[PDB]
């Protein structure tokens, strides 16, 4: 078991780090007991009145989509060029 996990230790820890950072990014800034103040403030703000998952303007969104399409085309072209110069393909 130790050998199997240790082979992929980097990936497992990076997933763990993602989960922990996401968990503490969405937490209120106050630690319990004090978190009661944050809860009361949030409830009051809801009654009286993001870094991730953000919505983009249409022009910027289209520019990003075209940029990613160009990157994908370059990646596929490099893959094709690598395939052509391989030993088996040359043979």
């Amino acid at each position: 078991t130790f050998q199997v996990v240790q082979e992929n230790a980097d990936i497992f820890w990076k997933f763990q780090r993602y989960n922990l950072i996401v968990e503490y990014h969405s937490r209120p800034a106050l630690a319990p007991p004090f978190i009661i103040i944050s809860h009361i403030t949030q409830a009051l703000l809801s009654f009286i009145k993001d870094l991730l998952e953000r919505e983009l303007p249409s022009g910027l969104d289209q520019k990003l989509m075209t940029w990613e399409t160009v990157q994908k085309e370059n990646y596929l072209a490099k893959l094709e060029h690598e395939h052509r110069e391989s030993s088996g393909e040359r043979l």
């Binding site: 289209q62 520019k63 399409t69 990157q71 085309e73």
Partner: protein, 374 residues
């Protein structure tokens, strides 16, 4: 006549233009292009000829051509000359240039799609006639069939609209040839205390017998031509004639009639045959790009430009722009085989600027080659 265009449609694109007459000096238009619009002297000019016929390119051929042209032009500052009307291969080339511009994170080098279009072929030209300096003319984008009148391509940044000539109705081709020749005679400043020419190439895709006069005019102006192998029209005629190796009147007329049934006129076909005969007779200014075989447009472009320069002169100062293109495209083998052969004599002072360019741009093979060559 300097006006800006606000393109309404899919994306808010801006475009400048200048109305010109058939008798205008190409020097004034180049001056306007450089200073009045801020376009730096380009390091490569590719002029798109043909592609306006009803017989369009196959999607694989069209995509390969546009992608290869844009990627070859992305290394340095290149101008792509088209008939800036939203139709045919011009529209797709504009789309590819647009896509590269959106995806480019380096605005230092720019690919500019400059259009040279007839004023009698622009849809809603009176709409853009206003061209107020404070208020750019609003121009709607309309996709239209083959027809006879198109709209300016929104993806072309700059336009050169040429009015019809009362004497002869061929002002557009003459203006294109004059601009290409004037650009080819230009000499931009290079680095420090140096100047370089601007490489000019013509790309032909599915020509019609009508542009043969302009093609021969450009050939006479020592401007190299590049021909798409499977383009569809005159391009197949030219590539087949080169494949045979010999061109005679009988074979020329046979191919011309076979690929163009509609053309049936003794004097006209004789003129076309003679034009083609002279075009092939030049030969050194013509090259074939077969995407099945070559599939690397930068290599073919560099080979064509080097062949034209070799047939032109033997001085090293004339090979400097071809060398710059070779450095930018990492074509060390072509440079060694052709540019740095025994035919051309290279001095140490001639290679200083390209040595700096290879050093700054991380081209160790060219650094080694320049050390090897003096």
């Amino acid at each position: 006549r300097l006006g800006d265009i606000d393109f309404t449609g899919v994306s808010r694109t801006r475009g400048k233009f200048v109305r010109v007459t058939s008798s205008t000096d190409p020097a004034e238009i180049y001056q306007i292009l450089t200073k009045q619009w801020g376009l730096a002297p380009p390091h490569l000019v590719v002029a798109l000829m043909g592609g306006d016929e009803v017989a369009q390119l196959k999607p694989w051929l069209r995509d390969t051509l546009r992608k290869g042209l844009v990627k070859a032009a992305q290394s340095t500052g290149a101008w792509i000359l088209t008939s800036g009307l939203r139709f045919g291969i011009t529209k797709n080339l504009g789309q590819a240039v647009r896509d590269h511009s959106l995806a480019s994170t380096s605005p230092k080098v720019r690919v500019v799609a400059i259009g040279i279009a007839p004023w009698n072929m622009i849809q809603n030209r009176d709409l853009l006639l206003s061209a107020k300096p404070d208020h750019p003319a609003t121009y709607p984008t309309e996709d239209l069939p083959y027809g006879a009148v198109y709209s300016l391509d929104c993806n072309h940044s700059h336009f050169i609209l040429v009015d019809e000539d009362p004497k002869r109705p061929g002002a557009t081709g003459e203006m294109r040839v004059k601009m290409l020749k004037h650009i080819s005679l230009q000499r931009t400043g290079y680095g420090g205390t140096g100047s370089i020419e601007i490489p000019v190439l013509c790309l032909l895709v599915h020509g019609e017998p009508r542009i043969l006069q302009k093609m021969y005019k450009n050939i006479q102006n020592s401007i190299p031509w590049l021909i798409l192998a499977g383009s569809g029209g005159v391009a197949d005629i030219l590539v087949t004639l080169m494949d045979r190796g010999c061109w005679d009147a009988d074979i020329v007329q046979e191919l011309l009639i076979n690929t163009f049934p509609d053309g049936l006129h003794s004097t006209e076909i004789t003129s076309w045959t003679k034009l083609i005969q002279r075009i092939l007779d030049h030969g050194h200014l013509l090259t074939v790009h077969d995407p099945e075989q070559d599939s690397e447009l930068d290599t073919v472009i560099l080979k064509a430009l080097v062949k034209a320069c070799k047939s032109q002169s033997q001085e090293a100062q004339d090979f400097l722009d071809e060398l710059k293109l070779a450095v930018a495209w990492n074509r060390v083998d072509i440079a060694k085989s052709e540019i740095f052969s025994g035919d051309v004599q290279w001095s140490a002072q001639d290679l200083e600027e390209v040595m700096m360019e290879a050093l700054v741009n991380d081209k160790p093979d060219f650094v080694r080659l320049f050390v090897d060559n003096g």
